[PDB]
Amino acid sequence: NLCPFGEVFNATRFASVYAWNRKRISNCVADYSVLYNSASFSTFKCYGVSPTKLNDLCFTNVYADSFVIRGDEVRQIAPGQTGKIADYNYKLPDDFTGCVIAWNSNNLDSKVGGNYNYLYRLFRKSNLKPFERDISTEIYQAGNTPCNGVEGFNCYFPLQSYGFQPTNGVGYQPYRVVVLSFELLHAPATVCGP
Amino acid sequence: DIQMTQSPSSLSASVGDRVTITCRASQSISSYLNWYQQKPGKAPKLLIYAASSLQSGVPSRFSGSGSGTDFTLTISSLQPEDFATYYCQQSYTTPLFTFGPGTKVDIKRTVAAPSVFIFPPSDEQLKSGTASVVCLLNNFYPREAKVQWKVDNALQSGNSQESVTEQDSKDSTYSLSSTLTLSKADYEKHKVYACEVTHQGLSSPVTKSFNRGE
Amino acid sequence: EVQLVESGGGLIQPGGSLRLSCAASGLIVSSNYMSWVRQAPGKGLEWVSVLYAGGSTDYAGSVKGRFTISRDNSKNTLYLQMNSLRAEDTAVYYCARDAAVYGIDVWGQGTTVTVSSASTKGPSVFPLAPSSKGTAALGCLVKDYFPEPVTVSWNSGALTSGVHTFPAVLQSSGLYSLSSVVTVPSSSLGTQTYICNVNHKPSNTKVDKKVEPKS
Ligand SMILES: *[C@@H]1O[C@H](CO)[C@@H](O)[C@H](O)[C@H]1NC(C)=O
């Protein structure tokens, strides 16, 4: 009856940023101490809380989002940001109350020769609403001309692969990120710490 | 950020030749950069996108390769409409692109040494208070040349400017003018105004010169 | 009718404002990465700013907070307002649709932005006289003229072979000096009359100056 973080932060399989991944946690406990005594993360900022004095802070249920993004895009995962990622892959709300945890995983997410399994939505007609998930693969239509499956002028496939390759400068390496989302509506809050 | 870099600053090639331009980027941009052609006065023209996908409306003789960090454009038979500067761009940070210095493909030709002519300042201009001396390395190949100015056998540095012409429609040869600027008081306190020029066509350097009163 | 015709920009002092216009036609600027890229005479291609489909913008540190990319999605036009202009901004500006990996395929016609606080002045025409010591050379110095450009001509067009007219130089005072020269048979040193005619339209100036050898 502990909150199953161990299967989110240590999961061998992360999803692409565009198809970011979510796990709702409820009915358990949580040791937010161990997460920031591990001290193995590169970036760990928390907005609208404070990791230490959060073990007494109970919440109805907490969400844990995970994906993978270029090292210099982790600045886009913050409340009030814009860019390729925050605008078309995962947008954080202005009034955000949670934590953003990232840790360079180039020793696993950029195999020899280039890892092309991780993608990032590149073309979109308007921006994401907070915690929105766009999975559409339909051919992006830049012009008046309906594409209907044909790549070509004014016709672009929206999802572009990262060129993950380990020799690249750190900025262009894979950084596994897992955003923690704490919410509390008027209902039995069951995600307490000790 | 990502640094781009072209190989030969400007190569020389003939019609029917098979040219090869290079381009290498700071990180391992994996197959994510296109090639562009620009002729003076016009806008860039896309040729190859995504390393090697040919652009529609582009002749068959334009190739494309490179996948990792070191790329290369290669034209099969250089046709006359292909003499222009070619740049490369990185579409890794797609919204935020960069280019290379460009590589200017001109016309190959036999070496031609430049005829040097030095001109003194006109008495008309001396009235206005400043003095202009002009040297001249008219008609030669290739572009590269080294014009030193010497006033009373003392090299001049920050006070000269240069301007080159295009390859002549008929010569295929270049021309140049190095314009030294001085004052009516400085020009008047020195006699010997010479112009030294070094070029591949000249065994040794040529000096066209003159004295204040002659 | 895929094309982008840009307009709005000629000459303005260091600080003044000038808005640029890119009139898209064929694609839609509302759903495309619309960038501006600037380019000087003796320089490469430099990116200036961006506007996404989601309306988000971004500009290079040498611009941030001085220019401001815009778009009117009712006239399918891309704009760029240029405030607190300076001399570094003098360059040709191209609007182009960045097709991401597919590359910048569509490009704006062209728009020049010469920027300086120099006052328009018809140029001086000093003569370059042939020297004593098979062939002799001579020409004209079209010194100190602003703004650009100026066209040269010898014997009203009766002389062409050999005549070179150079690309203009912008010198330290903020004015352009260029020279035009022709080589001729030395045997006509003092036989024919050579006159280099210059024209600077911005200052309405037209000059004809005979060139001969003093001694
Ligand atoms: C990830 O697993 C390691 C053991 O391999 C452990 O030290 C760490 O606490 C785990 N992190 C969790 C469960 O958050």
Answer whether B95 sits within 8 Å of C110, measured CB to CB.
no
Q: Which of C138, C181, C196, C214 to mutate to test the interface with B (most CBs of B within 10 A)?
A: C181
Chains that touch A (3 or more CB pairs under 8 A): B, C
**C150 interaction partners in chain B (CB closer than 8 Å):** none
Superfamily of domain B115-211: Immunoglobulins (2.60.40.10)
- B67 and chain C in contact, CB less than 8 A: no
Instruction: Report in angstroms the alpha-carbon separations of B165 from B94, B104, B168, B172, C157.
Output: 37, 15, 8, 11, 19
Q: What b/e readout covers C128-156, taking b as 16+ CB neighbours within 10 angstroms?
A: bbbbeeeebbbbbbbbbbbbeebebbbbe
Token match 């995600």: residue?
Answer: A191
Answer whether A169 sits within 8 Å of B26, measured CB to CB.
yes
Separation between Cα atoms, residue B35 and residue B64, nearest integer Å = 8
Give A6 Cα–ligand 1 centroid separation in angstroms: 6
Is residue A86 within 8 Å of A130, Cβ to Cβ? Answer: no
> What ranges do the domains of chain A cover?
5-120+162-183
The residues on B that touch A, with CB distances below 8 Å, are: 26-32, 56, 68, 92, 94-95
> What ranges do the domains of chain B cover?
4-107, 115-211
Instruction: Please give the residue of chain A at the shortest CA–CA distance from B31.
Output: A163
For ligand 1, whether the C-beta of A40 sits within 6 Å is no
Q: Which of A82, A85, A139 to mutate to test the interface with C (most CBs of C within 10 A)?
A: A82
Instruction: Report in angstroms the alpha-carbon separations of A88 from A14, A120, A166, A168, B117.
Output: 18, 8, 25, 24, 64
**Type and span of the H or E element at C20:** strand C18-25
Residue whose Cα lies nearest atom 3 of ligand 1: it is: A10
Answer whether A168 sits within 8 Å of B31, measured CB to CB.
no
Instruction: Please give the residue of chain A at the shortest CA–CA distance from B54.
Output: A152
Q: What b/e readout covers A90-124, taking b as 16+ CB neighbours within 10 angstroms?
A: bbbeeebebbbbbebbbeebbeeebbeebbbbbbb
Q: Kindly report the CA angle at C34 between C33 and C37, in degrees rounded to 5? A: 125
Fold classified for B4-107? Immunoglobulin-like (2.60.40)
For ligand 1, whether the C-beta of A103 sits within 6 Å is no
Q: Is B22 helix (H, G, I), strand (E, B) or coil?
A: strand
CA C82 remoteness from chain centre: 18
Burial of A13 (0-12, 13-18, 19+ CB in 10 A): exposed
Experimental technique = X-ray
Instruction: Report in angstroms the alpha-carbon separations of A41 from A44, A71, A105, C13, C105.
Output: 7, 13, 10, 52, 41
Q: Could you say which of A84, A122, A163 has the minimum Cβ distance to residue B29?
A: A163
- Residues 6 or more apart from A130 whose CB is under 8 A from it? A91, A92, A93, A96
Fold classified for A5-120+162-183? Alpha-Beta Plaits (3.30.70)
Task: List, in sequence order, every beta strand (DSSP E) within B76-183.
Answer: 85-90, 103-107, 115-116, 130-134, 137-138, 146-151, 155-156, 160-164, 176-183
The token duo for A7 is 């299967």
**B101 interaction partners in chain C (CB closer than 8 Å):** 44
Separation between Cα atoms, residue A18 and residue A159, nearest integer Å = 8
Token match 């072209």: residue?
Answer: B6
What is the secondary structure of C53-78 as a DSSP string? TTS-EEE-TTTTTTEEEEEETTTTEE
Separation between Cα atoms, residue A121 and residue A140, nearest integer Å = 11
Give the number of the atom of ligand 1 that is nearest the alpha carbon of residue A10: 1
Q: Can B4-107 and B115-211 be said to share one CATH topology?
A: yes
Mutational pocket test of ligand 1: of A23, A38, A180, the residue with most ligand atoms within 8 Å of the beta carbon = A38
C79 to chain B, closest Cα gap in Å: 18
For residue B26, count other CB atoms closer than 10 A to its CB: 17
Specify the pairing of strand B103-107 against strand B10-13: parallel
Is residue C69 within 8 Å of C56, Cβ to Cβ? Answer: no
**Terminal Cα distance for chain B, rounded:** 59
**A83 interaction partners in chain C (CB closer than 8 Å):** 56, 58
Q: What is the resolution of this structure in A?
A: 3.6
Separation between Cα atoms, residue A17 and residue A86, nearest integer Å = 10
Burial of B185 (0-12, 13-18, 19+ CB in 10 A): exposed
Is residue A120 within 8 Å of A18, Cβ to Cβ? Answer: yes
Give the number of the atom of ligand 1 that is nearest the alpha carbon of residue A34: 9
Q: Which of C107, C182, C209 to mutate to test the interface with B (most CBs of B within 10 A)?
A: C107
Q: Is A98 helix (H, G, I), strand (E, B) or coil?
A: strand
- Residues 6 or more apart from B35 whose CB is under 8 A from it? B21, B23, B46, B47, B48, B62, B64, B73, B86, B87, B88
Is residue C145 within 8 Å of C105, Cβ to Cβ? Answer: no
> Domains in chain C, start-ordered, CATH in brackets?
3-115 (2.60.40.10), 124-211 (2.60.40.10)
Amino acid at A21: N
For ligand 1, whether the C-beta of A10 sits within 6 Å is yes
Answer whether C54 sits within 8 Å of A127, measured CB to CB.
yes
